[PDB]
Every structure is written in C-alpha cells, then in structure tokens.
Design a protein around this ligand. Structure first.
Ligand SMILES: CCCCCCCCCCCCCCCCCCCC
Ligand SMILES: CCCCCCCCCCCCCCCCCCCC
Ligand SMILES: CCCCCCCCCCCCCCCCCCCC
Ligand SMILES: CCCCCCCCCCCCCCCCCCCC
Lengths: 164, 164, 164, 164, 164, 164, 164, 164
C-alpha cells in the first residue's frame, strides 16, 4: 500500500510530468540553436534535456518505492522560436527558477504533512537546482558582456559544445 | 536552404514526433508494468523507451543535415493501463508495426520524388523495425507458452529485466 | 504470424535450399580437386562451401525473424567430375552468376510487393555475389595465363590454398 | 592407387553421405525447434549439425589418404515436424543409435577384410558415438524430469542454447 | 567478360573522371586559399581533394570487378580564383550538389536497367554526398554570420586546418 | 610579393602540372595492367602515380614559399593502351627520362638567372629521378630475361604488387 | 534401457567388485609392511589401493552410461601376512596378472558379442595393466639386486615412499 | 610393542572395519540413486564414501602409532535398494548415528582404562559425527518440504550434486 499521502503522490507525479516537459522544452531550444547554426548551444541543450529526464526518472522510482503509481500526462507543445541566443538562455533560466519553485512547493507540502522521507528525498533536487540556475546565470552574464559580437558568441558556442 | 522538399521534411518531422510518442507510450507501458508488480517488464519498456529516443534523434540530425529544421509538437497522453501483460505487449507489437508502416510511407514518398538520400537514410530504420518487431513477437510467443501460469510469467519477467 | 507474404517466404526458403545445394556443389568440386592431387584448389572449394552455408543460415534466420518457417528440401546429386581445372571454375562461375540472378528475382518480387524489409535484407547478398563472382573470374584469368603449365598451376594451387 | 578395397571405399563413402544426412536432419530439427519458439534447442541442433559435418570431413580425408575418391550422393528430404520437444529428441537419439550401428557395420567389414588401418580409424567414431548417444540420453532425461513444466523447460532451452 | 552494360560502364567511367576533376577543383581552391594566405582553408581543401581521389578509385575498382575497363579522359582546367573565402565555398557547395545529382543520374540508369549490383554499390556515394554537402553548408552558414570579421575567419581557418 | 622571377615561376608551375600529368599517365598504365589481369603491375603503377603527386606537392609548397602562386592547368588525356607489359614499362622509363630532362631544364634556367635557392631545391628531384629511372630499368631487365615465361612474370607481378 | 547385454553388464559389474577387492588386498599388504616397520612400502601400497578404486569407479560410470546398474557384492577377507618383502611383492604381481587375465576375459566376451563400445572401453585397461605389472616387476628386480642388504632396502623404502 | 591394551586395539581395529563398511554402504546408496536417475544424490554418496575412508585411514595410522597392527576383515554385502529417496537417507542417518555411538563406546572404554591418548584421539571423530548427522538431517528436512514433489526432489538432487 502507499506510504505517502495521495496529496504528496499527486504532487510528485505532477512534478514528474513537469520534469518531462522541461526536458522537452530544452530539446526545443536545441532545435532552435541548430536552426540558427549554433551546434554548441544545441549540444548543451540536448545534454540539459537528458539531465532533466534522469531527474524525472528519479521521481519515477521514488513514487513506486513508496507504493505510489506514476501516471504519464499529456505534454504540451513547446515554443520553437526565440528572438536570439540570449533570449533563449534567459527563457531557460526562467524555466529553471520555475522548476525550483515547483520543488519548493512539494517540499512545503511534504513538510506540512510531516512526510520526513519525502522532505529528505527532495533535498537533492534543491541543491541540484541551485547548481543549474547558476550555470545559466553564468552563460547569460557572458552573453550580456558579449553584447552581440559574433566573435565571443562563437567561442561560447564552442565551449558549451564541450559539455560532457 | 533546405535540400529536401517541404513534403519530405514534414514527413520526417512528423515521424520524429511519432518516435517521441512511441518512447512515451513505452514509458507508460512501464508505469503499467511497475504498478502491476512486474519490474522486469518495466525495465524492458524503459530500455525500449530510450532506444526510441535515439531513433528520434537520428531523424533530428538528418533533418538538419538536409538543411531543414525540426519542430516539436504536442505529445498526446498515452494509455496507462492494459488488460494484462499479453494485452500490453500486443499493443506494443501493434504499435511497432505501425511505426514500421509509417517508416514505409516516408520511404515510398521519398522514392516517388527521387530523393535518394532520404530513401537510403531510411534503410537503417527499416532494419531496426525488423529487429524490434521480432523481439516482441518472441516475448508474446513465450508468454503464450506460460498459458496463464504465473510462476512462468514471473520467470519471463526476470529475463526481460536483464535487457542491457 | 508471418509478416512476409507466402510468395516471399517461398522465394526465401527456396533460395535457402539453393544455397545449400551450392554448398554441396562446391564440396563436390573439392572432391574432384582432391582426386586430381590439387590440395590447394580443394581447400578453396571447401572454404567456398562453408561460406555458402553461412549464406544459407542468414536466409534461415531472417525467415524466422519475419515469423516464417523454414522447410529443408531434398538435395540433388551434384556433378562430381570436370574436364580439367578450368572447366571446374567455369562451372563455379556459371553457378555463382545463377545464384546472383536468383537473388535478383527475390529482390524484384519483394520490391513489387513493397516488402522493403526484405529488399533491404537482400542488399548484403547482392554485394557478396559481386565479390564471389570476381574472385572466380580472377582465378579463371590466371588459369588462362597459366595455359596448363604445371609450373604456374602449382603456384595458383598454393596461393588459393592459403584462403582463410 | 587405392590401398583400400573397393568394398571398404564404398562403405566409407556411403558413411560420409550418411553423416551429411545426419547433419541435415539435425538442421531440420532446428527448423522445427525455431518454429516452436525454442531458440536454445534450435541452437543445440545447429551445433550438432556442424559437428556432424566435421565427422563427414574426417571420413572424407581418410578416403583420400588411402588413395580413394569421394563421390557425393543425393540427400533425401528429412522430416521437418515432431510431436513436441521430447519426440524430436527421441528421434535424435534413435538416429544416433542408427549411425552407431552404421559405424559398426563398416568396422566389421574392414575387420573381416583384415584392413587394420581402417579398423583403427573407425575406433574414434565408436567412442564418439558412445558420447553422442549419452548426450541425447542426458537431455531426454532432463526433459523427463521437467515433466511438462514450462518453467524448467525454459531453463533447459537457455542452457543448451549456450553450447559452444 | 563485362557483366555491366555498356551504358552503365560508360556512366561509371564518366563518373570516375568527374570525381577526378572534383579532386582537381578542390586542389585549385587550395591554390587560391594559399595564395590568400589561409593555410587552414587550404589544408581543408587539400584533404577534400584526396577524399575525392579515394572516391574515384572506388569507382575504378568496381568497374574492374564487373569485368569492365577504365579509360582516363582529359581533365579540364578548373577556375583558379574566387571572390573571397565565402565565394569559394559557395562554389564548393554548388559543385558538391552537382556531384550528388551526377550520382543520382547513374543510380536511376542502373535501376532502370535492373542492375541491382550497381544500384547497391552507389548507395555508399549517396550517403557520402549528404555528409559532404553538410560540411560545406555548415561552413557557409558560419561564414555568413561571420560577415567578414577577421577575428572569426581566423578561428575558422585554424579549426578547418585541423581536419585529419 | 614574388622573390622568384616570372620566368622561374612559370617553369616551376609548368613542372608542377607536368608532374600531375605523369601521375595521371601512371594511373592510365594501371588501367591497362588491371585490364590485362596483372593486379601487381597495376598496384605498382598506382603507387607510382601517388609518388608523382607528392612530387607535385613539393613544387607546390616551394612556389608559395618563394611568394609565387600555383595555377592548375588542363590535363590531357593519356594513352590507355600498350602492346604488352614490356611496352608499358618501356613507355614508363621513357616518360621518367622525359621528366628528368624537364627537371634539368628548370635547373639550367634557374642557374642562368643565378636563382641559387631554386637550383638547390631542384637537387632532391634530380636524385629522385636517378632512383626512379633505375627501378624501371631493373623491372625491364627482369622482363627481358623472363621472355614471356608466365612462371616468372607471375612472381614479378606478385612482387611489385607488394610495393608500399 | 540397457544397451549392453546382461552377460556383459554382469562381467563388468563383477570386474568392478574384483577391482574393489584388489584395492582391499593392497591395503592389506600396507598393513603388513607397516607392521614390519616399512612405512615406504606401506605408502606405495596405500597409493596402489587408491589407484584401484579409481579403476573400479571407471567401470562404475561406464556401466551406467550404457544403461546398466551396479550391484556391490561382499568383499572377501584378504591375506594379511607374507613371508617377507619379496614375498609380498610377488603376491602383488601375481594378483595384477590375475586382473589382467580378467580384463582379457571380458574383452574376449565383448568382442564375441560384437559390443564394440565395450571392447574399445577395455583397451585402456589392457594398456594400464601392462604398465602396472611392469612397475611391480621393476620393484622385484630392485629387491633382487638388494640381496637382503638392509642398507639398500632402507633406500628402496624411503624411495617408494615418495610415490604421489 | 603395543602400548595400547588388546581391548582398545580390537575396538579401534573393529571401528576401522566398520568405517570401511560405512564407506561401501554409502557407495551402495550411490548405486541405488544412479540406478534411479538421481546423479546429484549419487554424487553426494560418493563423496560421503570417500570421506569415511579418510576416517578409516586415520584409525589405521593411530593404531600403528601406538604399536598396534591392523587386520582387515571381510566386508559384508550392503543393501543395494531402498524404498525411495527418503528411505535411503533415513537409513544413512541411522547408520551415521550408529557409527557415532560406536565411537562413544570406544571413548568410554578407553576412558575407563585411563588411556588418555585414545580418549583425546577420538575427540576429532566425535566432532565430525556431529557435522555429518547434521548434514543428513538437513537433507531429510528438505525432502519433507519437497512433499513428494518430484520437481523439487530433482532440485535437491542438483544441489547435493555440487558437494565438493
Ligand atoms: C540528447 C537528446 C535527448 C532528447 C530527450 C527528449 C525527451 C523528450 C521527452 C519525452 C519523454 C521520453 C521518455 C523517455 C524515458 C526514458 C527512461 C529511462 C530510464 C532509465
Ligand atoms: C573443412 C571443410 C568443410 C566442408 C563443409 C561442406 C558442407 C557441405 C554442405 C552439404 C549440405 C548438408 C547440410 C549441412 C547443414 C549444416 C547446417 C549448419 C547450421 C549451423
Ligand atoms: C595533398 C593534395 C592532394 C592533391 C590531389 C590532386 C589530384 C589531382 C588529380 C590528377 C590525377 C592524379 C592521379 C591520382 C591517382 C591516385 C591513385 C591511388 C591508387 C590507390
Ligand atoms: C588413503 C588410502 C586408501 C585406502 C583405500 C582402501 C579401499 C578399501 C576398499 C573398500 C571399499 C570401500 C568403498 C570405497 C568407495 C570409493 C568411491 C569413490 C567415488 C569417487
């Protein structure tokens, strides 16, 4: 039987679907970067998409580990066009900060219900978000300093294209 | 500029989205199997899901390689329950046969427009489908030997759960 | 069930049987070369016999992979004597060319039925047939040059006796 | 010239062709096992078929080594269907026993003609036959113990499917 | 004897000479890049020239494999100048597309004559062209955004100058 | 700017083109040997063609090194047939000596203009020509002794066929 | 079922019991040497008893391989005293010769019944007996040269005591 | 001279003969299991038979070490059949417990005579008997859990056949 409340299971399941949309969003950003001829940015986004899927499966397993069941929901069509390089990364940061707040909402719900296990389990994602947001903020600061110069952008694209 | 016709690009892009759904459908089959207590069939479906993504990404890279662009579409909600294992795998088989025929449709279209590059590129998928379909027919035939015996179905669960 | 037509399965199965006779024929050629004291040429024919068997088995597995079944047919008695080294290889070439045309007939059949999986599958045999025919024409060219001089013929026998 | 009587040469040549039929019969049994979804048993049979061919070639070489010649004969169509796994293996055993007696008939003929060379050469086959019969009897015994339990039969299949 | 039709032999032989000119053109572009002091771009073109030679020799060998003969034709003087780096690459792309169409024309001819062996052999060149056109297109798009900036042009030179 | 006179530049560029024709002529000789079934002699000729290209590239680099530019010229159609092995190698020797005299001409021209750097650069080609001529004379001597005896020709062909 | 006649099985089973007695007999010789203070001789005899058991177990396994059954019979009390070292070894030799003849009798019976498998199987014991008798004769000859001299017997004892 | 009493020597010498019979009895149990198709249980008994012999030999050596002599007695015919598996092992246990008591009798006898060396020497055997009885009881316990399930009985057979 489930050892988590139906409320927490729902919250986790929806976060699972939320992570899947995140991954699909970043893939969409990759289709945009590839369209604009920036293989390095595209590459970074494909990796970011992959990392997001692992996050989703990490929620997947926990849900079953507590007797819960995962229900895959419809995934919405993501945007495919951005004004430019910086805008796409800006949207990536805004999206990360959104998933971080989504994580926060589950943590507060689990905390209110004294579901200490789930609260402990979420700690990892909190720390991971602080890391992802910082990555994007760095890229943005760099793009901001680049101020449109194709020379710096090309470097940035080459570097980000190195992400393992 | 695109060197593939708009008709072929569209056929390729829709197949790309179709692969993503196939992956999602298999993940959903996995949620069904995990909920029913069959980890083995679950593990297999997950692996089958990742394989379908690598397929989608091949369509992805080729579309760009031909000067086109990828556009990600909305992914409909997949079924989350089946009337038993056999019913599940049969839906899986039925689905693969459907993607195979989809693949066949692009190939005839490309062939008709004398787009030899796309016709040749599709060859790899035709061969994969032959392999994927055969693995499901195998499983279905093995389940058939179980003839309801659960102790046997559990043995097939432990085997499929060995997939690398 | 069978995802290949009865017509196609028959064409495959009959080709499989044809490949087995081919193997037996090359073995027979080996019995002739060994009786004439040419161990090297015999060795070559034995290697060629095994090759053809691997071809047979390739058709064998594909047939089952497409839900078909293989039925082994009676193998006719192959010739056991030839009018000299040249005559033997000439017969071998003639047979190889017959096998290729056979391969061709199955391909056009599958193509007419839009059985792309099978058309694709046959490509490998088409390329192998090109390689096999060429090996025999080279041998026949060298024999033509040898013009019956035991001196060079011994060399040919030695070289061919090196085939792995 | 031949240093074996024409009688012994004929008996050796007929045994060679008899080994080839054995090899073919075992392949036919493989067609049946594969048709029945038992890859493993089919594998064991494909290996058995190959082993039989090495035995035929061992008769082949001896014949030439005694100055004889080999003449390949037609190969009759073998049976392609059995009433279950146990029935196929029983027919295999029965076939083995038949080849064992075949080897005895030659041994006795050679011994009658005082062909000590050929008698000694046959010694190897007598010993091998004892081992080949034991193997099949061992398998039959495992099948009898399985007593229709698809569970253990699944294990047997996978086991025999490992034959090197 | 020739097993390919005279029409196909002629098409192949003409394509071999076409690949040779292609090699020579790319070398000519190297003469231009070196005259403009771009070692990296020149290097890339020298490597491309070699790649084309290997293609010509694959046609050479296939012609002999089908019993045909190669006849080398005169090679026309290629252009030795272009209006800047980008212009040279536009010319390269347009030339790569011409080669692809040339390959297409042979494929269709062979296909119409039912020369399956030749249609199959050409598949490799269809796939290689897709890859060659893509490299050039990628380079052109990068130069397009470079808009003549000497900074990025130097980055491109070095990068391309690494081609192995 | 150019530090070599236009006259010397012309002579070096024309020699570069001459080397390319040599390369092409040796390939042509290869098409003749392959057509006659002497793969070894064909191989040797293909290796000789490659060696001639490296020489062309030597001239190429020196021209740029002295501030000149290379201009690829049309390459004429070479003969494609000879009256036999001996005849072909003889035509090869005669061509090599033609190349040597050509090298002599540039050398005398550079020496008259006191272009010591070019005179010095040409020394390497004068010594290489000594080696090239000798290799063909050596082959011609063996063919002379062979006097048609296919027995030694085969050996000569396999030997030359081993050139690296 | 049994593939050996009841008469052969009987002969084999009885030989097994016979081998077991030999073992017991040699152990008894060990009890005599030990009592006489010759640990080395005792050691050799204990190893000999072990060898005899391994021989008995060879008959054991062969009997079941041919569908037979082993029935252990009573073991008679062996002598426990001898008139000296030499006497003990003469008795062992005489016993060995007895088993050799016993093997001979079974061999002859098997041969008469045309049971080639059993004849072949007994070959190993024929050769083994020749070697065993030889070891005992070798010891007897060393005891002869010894000529009652304790000095030499001490060495012989310590020596035979090294048998592994 | 004998430093052990004739009473203790006889009890030790009789125990040695008892251990040999125990060995033979367990071999007989193995003849029964093999006859019934259980190789595992037969394997087990074979190992048990060998273990008992080492016990015998330990008694053997100790007897000499105390200046006594060993006299091998006639060994009786052991039972060759049992009313099923359980019946055999139960007899085995009964026999184990019997040799245990026999050991106790010698121990109490030696103790009564103040033969401390013999009392100490027997300790090892008391401990080994505990180990052996426990093994047989565990086997019987598992046979009970098998509850006539031939399927399970074969599983145990395979387990005991792994004894080292
Ligand atoms: C590098 C390209 C990565 C593209 C990722 C695209 C993701 C699209 C979202 C759809 C969900 C797919 C389901 C996949 C589940 C995989 C589970 C693996 C478990 C080990
Ligand atoms: C060392 C030389 C080897 C010669 C091999 C000759 C084979 C001739 C084929 C005769 C046809 C008999 C059927 C054989 C079926 C073998 C199936 C193998 C399946 C793995
Ligand atoms: C390093 C720069 C490469 C320059 C290639 C220039 C090619 C010019 C075309 C002229 C024809 C030359 C003949 C080449 C024959 C090669 C044969 C290889 C056989 C394995
Ligand atoms: C270490 C010294 C060896 C002494 C051997 C004495 C043998 C006496 C014969 C009595 C028979 C006992 C039964 C032995 C069965 C052995 C089975 C082995 C199976 C691998």
């Amino acid at each position: 039987m489930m050892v988590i409340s139906e409320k927490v299971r729902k919250a986790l399941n929806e976060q699972l679907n939320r992570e899947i949309y995140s991954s699909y969003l970043y893939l969409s950003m990759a289709t945009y970067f590839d369209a604009e001829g920036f293989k390095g940015f595209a590459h970074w986004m494909k990796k970011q998409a992959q990392e997001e899927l692992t996050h989703a499966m990490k929620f997947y397993e926990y849900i079953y580990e507590r007797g819960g069941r995962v229900e895959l929901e419809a995934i919405e069509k993501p945007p495919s066009n951005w004004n430019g390089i910086k805008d796409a990364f800006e949207a990536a940061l805004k999206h990360e900060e959104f998933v971080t707040q989504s994580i926060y909402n589950i943590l507060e719900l689990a905390s209110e219900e004294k579901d200490h296990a789930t609260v402990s389990f979420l700690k990892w994602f909190v720390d991971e978000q602080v890391e992802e947001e910082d990555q994007v903020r760095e890229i943005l600061d760099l793009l901001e300093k680049a101020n449109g110069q194709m020379s710096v952008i090309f470097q940035l694209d080459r570097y980000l294209g190195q992400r393992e």
